[PDB]
Amino acid sequence: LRDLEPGIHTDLEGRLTYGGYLRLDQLLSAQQPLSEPAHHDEMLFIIQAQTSELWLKLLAHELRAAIVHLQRDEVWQCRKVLARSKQVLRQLTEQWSVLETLTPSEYMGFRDVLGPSSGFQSLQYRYIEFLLGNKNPQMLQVFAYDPAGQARLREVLEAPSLYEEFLRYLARFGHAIPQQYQARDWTAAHVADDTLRPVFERIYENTDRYWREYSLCEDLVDVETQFQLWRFRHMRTVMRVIGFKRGTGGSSGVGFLQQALALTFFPELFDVRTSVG
Amino acid sequence: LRDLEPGIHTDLEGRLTYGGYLRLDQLLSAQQPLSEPAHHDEMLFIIQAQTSELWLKLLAHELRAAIVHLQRDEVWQCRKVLARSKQVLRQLTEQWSVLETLTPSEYMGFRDVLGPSSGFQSLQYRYIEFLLGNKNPQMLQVFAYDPAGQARLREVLEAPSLYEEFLRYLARFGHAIPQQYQARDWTAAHVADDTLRPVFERIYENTDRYWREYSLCEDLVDVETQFQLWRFRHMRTVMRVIGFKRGTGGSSGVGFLQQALALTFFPELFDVRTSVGVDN
Amino acid sequence: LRDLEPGIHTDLEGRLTYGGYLRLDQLLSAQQPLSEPAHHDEMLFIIQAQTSELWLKLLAHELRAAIVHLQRDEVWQCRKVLARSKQVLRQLTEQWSVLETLTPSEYMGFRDVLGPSSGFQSLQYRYIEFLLGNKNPQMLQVFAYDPAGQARLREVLEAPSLYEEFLRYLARFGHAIPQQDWTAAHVADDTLRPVFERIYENTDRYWREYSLCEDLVDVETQFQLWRFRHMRTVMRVIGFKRGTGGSSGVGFLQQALALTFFPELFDVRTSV
Amino acid sequence: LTYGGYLRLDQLLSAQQPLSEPAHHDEMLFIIQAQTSELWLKLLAHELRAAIVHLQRDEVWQCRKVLARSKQVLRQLTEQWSVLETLTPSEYMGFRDVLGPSSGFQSLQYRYIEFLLGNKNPQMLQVFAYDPAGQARLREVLEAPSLYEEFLRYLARFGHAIPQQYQARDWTAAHVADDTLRPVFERIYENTDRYWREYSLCEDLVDVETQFQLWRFRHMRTVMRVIGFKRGTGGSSGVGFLQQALALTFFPELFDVRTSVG
């Protein structure tokens, strides 16, 4: 039994309210299941994908701000933004546990309705792959229906990635970074650089001296590990919902998702492990 | 690098698209922060609550189908929907971990833009409270500025709660349940009932005979516990973000949320703990 | 400011206490770090493995009891026990986030104290692997140093796995299970395809079998998730170095990730 | 040198002795849950002492890294309530009786941490008179500054207007909320760019406190579903007494300050 407290605002007709702020007429009218007749499991499928897109939208928002901080040598602010980015990635990774309550026989009841639609065609996800530095320009042909989107990806292809922004940062602080990281063709995905090995060994072996750099390396390594966790959980959900069936978007499915899982964002950070003392 | 596989569809201009299926133009233009100049932390804020509203939207949809299964005595199917249900609640509780990177000085550059806006005004939240049985008609009067959703809250206010559908299910199976659960003024929140004590002791003490009922008992305790934890984590974030300031919605804040934490949805379930044996 | 209630027992001078009951003296004296001087990270290292061994111990206990309920056609009870088993795998998966605060320059301070010791020689771990059906008789050799434990492991190798007991349950219920030495891995069987297809295609008749099939998919998935977090933790801390146990490291762990406990469960998704 | 030998797994894995006759299936969950928790509480103490030693030395980045691991331990501790909640009250009733008066209220390590964090209650030492040398370990943590008091000493070296009280004093008393720290915390939260170090430390302690309150709450919610409103084996009222610890605050001034910032 809880009594309405005095002082709670109740005439709200000419004022800003929660659904108005949050644009919830528009937000909560965006779920349009297409099964005929309605499948109970369709609503889950939509919500799960939409909550992920909202988190990915926020993750983009925070990564951009982390890059701006790095550029300005604002390390504590960068790392704070990065901690929120890791929490976002963690929420993403945690929501697979809802979709694990979707069995393949439930799925076959509406998989049909989706046609060729696939997360492979997520503009926001591809933006983030590109921003972390996994720059594949084949992936621009996917967005040929969409000139504005393909054009916002081109801007990210054309700019240094998160990692390349860290290398530039390191350069400004007298670490032995090649001049090529100051200007080069950024559309070309970072190639593993053996000469960065002694740089990262020197960081991790004077953590007293290179406390900021060592902090940032461990952040980046956290970011990558969490994104790979996201990919693995997605891929395990695939295995349990469609098995080894080809995807809606035309790919081989599990084997195609496995090829991303093999790839590495920040290669010299992990390579340094065989030699660090 | 990963090479684009040969069989990928790239020409989708006349077919159902991911973005059109998920109505992404619409969804990702619902974020309209009001700070001037722009505040970095406002988008976290809107997105935290928006993803919560989407989860709460999925939660009312599973809750409903759980009731329909209860009504039809479809118990395995009911428990399967409650398991999805508890996972939604479990994400809703886990996302608190993101907002806990919002400090009070951050929050202070935009809390003003909100005016009176408060999750206290969340229609879906209240729809679920009322559905789990916390039916307070004083809540209808906070929605008078919106007759349509006021009307939706009355439809649920007037139907049996989830708990009350459970008691009805027990009734159909020969358990010793009072006749009022058959027909009563469903708009009065359930009062704790001492006659249900021997019912639940019987279930918990003979789990081989009453396994279905027993497993559903534990589902509802799970559901209540997960919702308490959402409440508690929301309250703990209130304390770290605004301390003991009054809420934007007019309440005294933490103290006001503390009184909801004190409430219990399924009281005879927890009360039985005091007297239960020994499984036979 | 919290006052002690009158009523609270404060003279335990001769009674059963928390610590006497839990044997906390013997649990809490079991952390024996070898660094000279002490390395602050060694304690993490030790406790992380030990909580995990305690959880592996609880999982072996729960899984045997799921098998017993299964032998007995006690399906609700079997799933209740698979529910706790899942939660125990879930703690095992979660605690990886602590050891992920260990950096490689930290670890190089005491890695060498450890000699050849490795979770590869975790007896409880391997007990679980054999239980879930990943039986490799070559594993017995690594415990020849410990014949009580070696022989106990051999007893699990020669009994039906959790998966084999499910299939045998299905047989007692009129499922077209083949009439067909448990120490060999279970070879995948395309004649089980239609058995699984029938289960998933009429959930209202085979709701019990359907539930359990889904409980085993969950367990396998949670287990793979464990292997993956351990493996990603391996890449962050030793990269591609050879393991202390003498293996290739991440490579040898990847070969385990590619393995499947319940092949025909996953296989049936292509035809359902 | 083996895994099993390195980790003392013979004494570790024979420390589980259920007392129920005939043995109860659920007794092993029960034992393991409290034992894993104890091993985590042992790590948590090992880390927070280290973090105090870093603060004493003005080593902020090292202190923050150990507080990062410490939150992760608190996190496993809170998460594990999910296994224990598969135990139903009728299952518990099968072995509750073997337990006598034993209670987590007698956890030495829990109490060590309560006292480090600075909820010092000298009343507690009595519970432990049966173990006189563990009672004296406790008294050593009652006599030293808390983690919070060491933070306030840190601020004082660095030019914050911290009272003279906190330079030395009778640490055996719970810290008593102090209004004069308010302008202190306001300066810090209002000039993050100046006091980024202090600001981030302030936010870490708020994270430790919240997570510890979350452990308390999930423990309390478990006690409800398992024994409900019954008295505890240790002799308290049970839920009501635990609810009294939940209303306690470790670091009042950090939460008090939300009232006036910005």
Ligand code: HEM
């Ligand atoms: C159980 C439901 C799901 C199944 C069966 C599934 C399956 C697949 C398959 C087979 C692919 C490869 C592309 C293709 O051929 O379609 C794919 C890619 C993808 N999915 Fe899903 N997926 C599911 C849910 C989701 C959800 C909820 C999200 C969140 C938005 C998501 C995001 C992605 C993304 C971003 C890719 C591109 C991955 C890459 O390019 O490496 N998927 N998925």
Ligand code: HEM
């Ligand atoms: C950090 C941000 C938040 C703060 C400071 C906060 C604070 C408050 C306060 C002070 C109240 C009491 C009503 C009033 O006077 O305003 C309230 C209620 C509520 N908030 Fe929040 N809230 C926050 C975030 C959220 C979010 C993200 C959600 C998303 C679900 C949410 C959902 C609710 C709900 C449903 C209530 C009503 C609870 C009840 O009636 O028992 N809040 N909150």
Ligand code: HEM
């Ligand atoms: C920094 C921590 C760790 C590293 C660098 C590590 C490394 C390794 C490596 C390299 C192997 C392969 C065999 C070898 O050559 O030694 C292995 C196997 C193993 N580790 Fe770890 N491990 C770590 C922590 C842990 C923890 C905390 C546990 C918990 C028990 C664990 C359990 C295992 C198990 C069970 C195996 C064998 C798995 C199989 O045979 O497929 N490890 N580990």
Ligand code: HEM
């Ligand atoms: C079914 C499980 C449990 C029940 C029914 C339970 C019940 C209680 C009760 C009633 C109390 C208050 C004192 C008393 O009368 O004994 C208590 C205290 C305590 N329990 Fe538990 N408990 C449970 C599990 C656990 C576990 C797994 C731990 C892990 C270490 C734990 C740690 C504690 C601690 C540290 C206290 C004292 C807290 C304080 O002084 O504020 N408990 N428990």
Ligand SMILES: N[C@@H](Cc1c[nH]c2ccccc12)C(=O)O
């Ligand atoms: N990277 C982990 C642990 C950590 C905290 N501070 C650090 C400083 C340096 C290296 C690692 C850390 C985290 O950010 O939570």
Ligand SMILES: N[C@@H](Cc1c[nH]c2ccccc12)C(=O)O
């Ligand atoms: N690509 C997925 C389909 C999918 C999963 N989630 C989605 C969300 C929207 C559109 C399609 C999807 C499959 O092969 O089945």
Ligand SMILES: N[C@@H](Cc1c[nH]c2ccccc12)C(=O)O
């Ligand atoms: N309620 C817990 C444990 C459980 C599983 N099956 C049960 C059957 C009856 C009672 C409890 C249970 C869960 O669903 O995880």
Ligand SMILES: N[C@@H](Cc1c[nH]c2ccccc12)C(=O)O
């Ligand atoms: N009640 C909150 C305001 C709030 C929190 N989250 C929200 C989401 C949307 C609108 C308003 C809010 C406060 O008192 O500060």
Ligand SMILES: N[C@@H](Cc1c[nH]c2ccccc12)C(=O)O
């Ligand atoms: N496998 C999931 C979802 C589930 C619940 N009950 C089921 C019955 C049948 C199939 C799947 C389920 C779980 O155990 O929570």
Ligand SMILES: N[C@@H](Cc1c[nH]c2ccccc12)C(=O)O
């Ligand atoms: N095998 C690990 C060492 C290891 C990790 N956890 C352990 C626990 C106990 C003994 C050894 C270990 C390595 O290659 O470095």
Ligand SMILES: N[C@@H](Cc1c[nH]c2ccccc12)C(=O)O
């Ligand atoms: N307290 C959170 C958020 C955070 C990270 N860095 C910070 C610096 C200042 C204040 C808060 C933070 C954490 O430790 O991750």
Ligand SMILES: N[C@@H](Cc1c[nH]c2ccccc12)C(=O)O
């Ligand atoms: N205090 C508990 C008993 C208890 C719970 N967990 C424990 C672990 C060890 C010893 C006793 C306990 C009760 O009232 O039932």
